[PDB]
From a paper:
SARSr-CoV spike proteins cover the coronavirus membrane and are exposed to the solvent environment in preparation for contacting a potential host cell, undergoing a suite of conformational changes to bind the viral receptor known as angiotensin converting enzyme 2 (ACE2, in the case of [name]-related coronaviruses) and mediate membrane fusion. Each spike is composed of three identical monomers containing key domains involved in restructuring from the pre- to post-fusion state as well as in receptor binding. These include the S1 receptor binding domain (RBD) and N-terminal domain (NTD), the S2 fusion protein (FP), heptad repeats, and the transmembrane domain (TM), among others. Here we report three novel structures of SARSr-CoV spike proteins belonging to bat SARSr-CoV [name] (hereafter [name]), and civet SARSr-CoV SZ3 (hereafter SZ3) and SARSr-CoV 007 (hereafter 007), at resolutions of 1.88 Å, 1.92 Å, and 2.10 Å, respectively.
Author numbering:
A (entry chain A): 681 to 728
B (entry chain A): 825 to 1017
C (entry chain B): 681 to 1113
D (entry chain C): 584 to 592, 605 to 651, 658 to 680
E (entry chain C): 247 to 294
Write the structure that this text describes.
Amino acid sequence: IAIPTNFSISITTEVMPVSMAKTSVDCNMYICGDSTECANLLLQYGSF
Amino acid sequence: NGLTVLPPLLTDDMIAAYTAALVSGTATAGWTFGAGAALQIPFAMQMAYRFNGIGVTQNVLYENQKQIANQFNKAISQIQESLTTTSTALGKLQDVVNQNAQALNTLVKQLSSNFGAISSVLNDILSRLDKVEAEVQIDRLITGRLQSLQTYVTQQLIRAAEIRASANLAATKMSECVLGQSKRVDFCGKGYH
Amino acid sequence: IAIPTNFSISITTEVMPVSMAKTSVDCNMYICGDSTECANLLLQYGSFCTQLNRALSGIAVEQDRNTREVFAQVKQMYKTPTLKDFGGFNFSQILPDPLKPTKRSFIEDLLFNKVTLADAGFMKQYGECLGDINARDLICAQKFNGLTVLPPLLTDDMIAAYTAALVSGTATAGWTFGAGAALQIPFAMQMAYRFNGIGVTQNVLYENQKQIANQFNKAISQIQESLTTTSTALGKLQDVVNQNAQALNTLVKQLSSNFGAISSVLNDILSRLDKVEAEVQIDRLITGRLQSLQTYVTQQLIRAAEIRASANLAATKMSECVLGQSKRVDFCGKGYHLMSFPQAAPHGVVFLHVTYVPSQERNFTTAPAICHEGKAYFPREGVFVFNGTSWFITQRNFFSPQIITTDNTFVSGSCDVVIGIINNTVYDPLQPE
Amino acid sequence: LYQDVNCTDSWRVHSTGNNVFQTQAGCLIGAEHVDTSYECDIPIGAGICASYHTVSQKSIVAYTMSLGADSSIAYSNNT
Amino acid sequence: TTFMLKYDENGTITDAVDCSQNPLAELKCSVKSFEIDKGIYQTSNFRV
Ligand SMILES: *[C@@H]1O[C@H](CO[C@@H]2O[C@@H](C)[C@@H](O)[C@@H](O)[C@@H]2O)[C@@H](O[C@@H]2O[C@H](CO)[C@@H](O[C@@H]3O[C@H](CO)[C@@H](O)[C@H](O)[C@@H]3O)[C@H](O)[C@H]2NC(C)=O)[C@H](O)[C@H]1NC(C)=O
Ligand SMILES: *[C@@H]1O[C@H](CO[C@@H]2O[C@@H](C)[C@@H](O)[C@@H](O)[C@@H]2O)[C@@H](O[C@@H]2O[C@H](CO)[C@@H](O[C@@H]3O[C@H](CO)[C@@H](O)[C@H](O)[C@@H]3O)[C@H](O)[C@H]2NC(C)=O)[C@H](O)[C@H]1NC(C)=O
Ligand SMILES: *[C@@H]1O[C@H](CO[C@@H]2O[C@@H](C)[C@@H](O)[C@@H](O)[C@@H]2O)[C@@H](O[C@@H]2O[C@H](CO)[C@@H](O[C@@H]3O[C@H](CO)[C@@H](O)[C@H](O)[C@@H]3O)[C@H](O)[C@H]2NC(C)=O)[C@H](O)[C@H]1NC(C)=O
Ligand SMILES: *[C@@H]1O[C@H](CO)[C@@H](O[C@@H]2O[C@H](CO)[C@@H](O[C@@H]3O[C@H](CO)[C@@H](O)[C@H](O)[C@@H]3O)[C@H](O)[C@H]2NC(C)=O)[C@H](O)[C@H]1NC(C)=O
Ligand SMILES: *[C@@H]1O[C@H](CO[C@@H]2O[C@@H](C)[C@@H](O)[C@@H](O)[C@@H]2O)[C@@H](O[C@@H]2O[C@H](CO)[C@@H](O)[C@H](O)[C@H]2NC(C)=O)[C@H](O)[C@H]1NC(C)=O
Ligand SMILES: *[C@@H]1O[C@H](CO[C@@H]2O[C@@H](C)[C@@H](O)[C@@H](O)[C@@H]2O)[C@@H](O[C@@H]2O[C@H](CO)[C@@H](O)[C@H](O)[C@H]2NC(C)=O)[C@H](O)[C@H]1NC(C)=O
Ligand SMILES: *[C@@H]1O[C@H](CO)[C@@H](O)[C@H](O)[C@H]1NC(C)=O
Ligand SMILES: *[C@@H]1O[C@H](CO)[C@@H](O)[C@H](O)[C@H]1NC(C)=O
């Protein structure tokens, strides 16, 4: 049998993601910008 | 283009305060503050208890206290030096940040794609075409950009599921490795935790 | 060092979703209703509906699997004991009442009252919907559009029977029925073993049996009272139910959206336009409604992945907290886990985690080791403390000072190495002779 | 299996050839009910399972699922 | 009506399924195979 006679204290790093960026989208702004006609067409298209 | 990033509720200072409280609690109380009321204990005796945890008698810790403390300090200094260089140790967090930024930027860039319409420039369409033909082209563009947003949101949901698995594992690690000594093999570091 | 002198028995509730609604879609019904022309056009467009239904059927089978993995962890359905009192521990609230017609326990009744499940039962006859048109029932609206909810394989009664069997097994056998054949054991002895399993000697449990039983009963009553209130304790299960209902209802509402077509009403298009232009508009509508169904199925898959993670965790909790005592920190309730009980709830489970919380800490002067003659004795199993006049050795989680003696100490080395050694005397049992 | 049809006592079914009877999951047509409980082979729902069994010839038989082997394991306080 | 035809190695129609004959035929047409495994399958909602 092999028996250890000495020891070491090791310190190892474990990197763990916890959160990601919280984001929100102004659907009308992205799809239509500042166009009024596009905004009306988007309303007619349906609110997804 | 309507894409905004909201600040996290807990500031970096608040998270640092939580971390400092956790470190101070484990230094002063140890594992006892994860179950009930924090019970004070000298750090050397806590070390003796945690040595007994991994099957090594307490006399090993007490009779080699200075050597073990020096080894701990040297390990701390080594991690400090390794972090001080320009390594990629934090590649996972950088990957998360890059993924978020890339998703938003590709969302911005996809606005240039015609989706079967004569152009991707809404103002050009509305300047050349009257209500009906402009409506046809703009409907094509709306379908395409809605698809882009839906793809972004679906990818965000999948990434959020992965991040939630990581965060649940991190909470489990906080409970079982920081607030107590884990007997699970290779859960809290490699070796006898 | 601070050593607790007293303790409390705490019972805490952990609510875990285990399954969500099993759903199926009649793709033709949702997209085309009862139109033959639209059905032919959908055939020509291409059958992506088989893929959608394959995914949804996988989800449904997964829901049944989740429930089976969480609850069907007993080989034999142990009979409910006639007497609900075990050594003073009163199990009446968590076991079915022989007299009442419910067949479930009282706490289970409260839990099933807390959550609003919308429609009861999964059967809605055509005559029923046609006879109450004035009330725009949501279920009729979504059934008329091809969206159906399938009943879970295990009924609430069978799940309650599983829970009753688990509770009875842990009451009569304990942890032994999770490994091999259920071995009978008196409940007080089981509690003594589970006390030993968190570093507290059995003497503590036996010598304070009545007080501990009273604390357990009072905790049961307090959870009962807190549940007997309009509090949102079961917000997770209600959230699951609301999510399913909202997904189906938004699917129903999305039928009103023009997808670039002149109208969202198929009958209007077919009444005004001939085959070709109608085909163009109906192709737009088919694309849009197919996208709506695909979004629904994708979101259902993601929600089902989350629910499966929850169900796997719940199965792990049932294995490690109900069928055994877990040493993992903060896995089975907060504190030194003693045991756990499952209670069925709509679309999920509720774990009553019984834990030992130390309290009433007293400060003492401590010493890492004791120098006697010329050797350093160490506590072995315990810790040295100064009671004010004499040094004692006591267990960490409960102040029970004991005379320091060679039996409870082991010697190692000399006193020079020890840093904070304290001079003291160590008795020897052979000294009586 | 018709989930939204009551046939306990014209029904909205296809043929109603024979062996029509009601279960918690709805009106089942073409299966012979058996009062014995077995393990689930084809889960029908609401605690009802189907299988292919030799009948008093082989036929589809619907029954109540068996939850497991019932046992007593009576409690005692000194054994 | 809708039929599922079978073309063999030589390209001759050797078999067919009439999707509207009975629920089993509808299931066969939906899964696009002449062989169905043992189990329970969702089919079209009751049509009148
Ligand atoms: C186990 O081996 C260690 C030395 O091993 C090496 O150092 C350890 C601290 C760990 O980092 C190991 O991974 C590594 O291989 C023995 O104790 C150490 O030995 C040194 C050198 O002999 C001792 O000297 C100390 O430091 C300097 C240099 O000698 C002098 O000023 C002093 O004499 C002082 O003692 C030292 O005590 C010790 N290391 C310390 C205190 O940090 C160790 O003896 C051996 N096993 C056992 C059971 O003793
Ligand atoms: C710890 O403190 C308890 C009292 O503390 C309070 O009550 C507990 C039951 C818990 O709810 C605590 O969170 C709470 O702060 C002392 O127990 C008190 O006296 C007796 C004896 O311990 C308790 O029960 C007794 O049990 C037997 C059998 O009946 C008989 O001695 C008595 O008839 C009595 O029932 C009693 O419930 C409790 N008092 C109250 C108001 O709850 C306890 O003595 C102390 N620690 C130790 C080690 O004894
Ligand atoms: C499916 O249909 C069965 C039988 O058909 C029922 O009776 C017919 C004459 C028509 O009125 C049908 O519309 C009606 O559904 C139903 O079974 C019936 O269930 C009810 C409710 O449990 C029973 O009423 C109860 O009967 C006794 C005696 O009064 C007491 O429990 C109650 O006071 C209450 O009246 C009814 O007797 C029972 N009928 C038969 C013939 O057994 C069934 O509810 C229905 N729906 C399903 C199965 O989902
Ligand atoms: C175990 O706990 C249960 C809690 O459900 C105890 O049953 C409860 O016992 C009390 C006291 O006898 C009953 O209160 C009585 O109710 C009616 C009026 O509502 C009347 O009989 C009395 O005036 C008294 O208030 C209570 O109803 C009863 N609850 C149930 C659901 O049965 C049970 O006694 C406990 N067992 C032991 C051995 O301590
Ligand atoms: C226990 O502590 C006392 C007080 O010192 C405190 O605790 C130490 C462990 C360390 O963290 C100090 O910085 C703290 O202030 C120790 O007393 C020291 O011992 C020397 C030498 O005997 C004495 O002359 C000094 O007054 C103290 N020095 C300092 C810097 O406070 C004591 O030795 C400790 N006992 C044990 C067993 O470790
Ligand atoms: C048709 O092709 C077959 C070989 O293909 C197999 O048989 C087919 C009928 C069909 O079932 C395929 O899916 C099969 O893979 C030919 O069969 C042989 O034809 C030769 C003459 O060419 C004749 O002498 C053999 O007896 C036939 N039998 C076998 C078993 O090979 C068949 O001839 C083709 N039909 C023609 C050429 O008209
Ligand atoms: C300490 O131990 C002695 C031993 O007799 C006992 O009388 C006393 O009450 C204990 N408590 C304190 C605070 O000294
Ligand atoms: C313990 O006693 C020894 C003699 O037996 C003495 O030399 C030593 O100083 C004492 N230790 C302390 C900490 O008082």
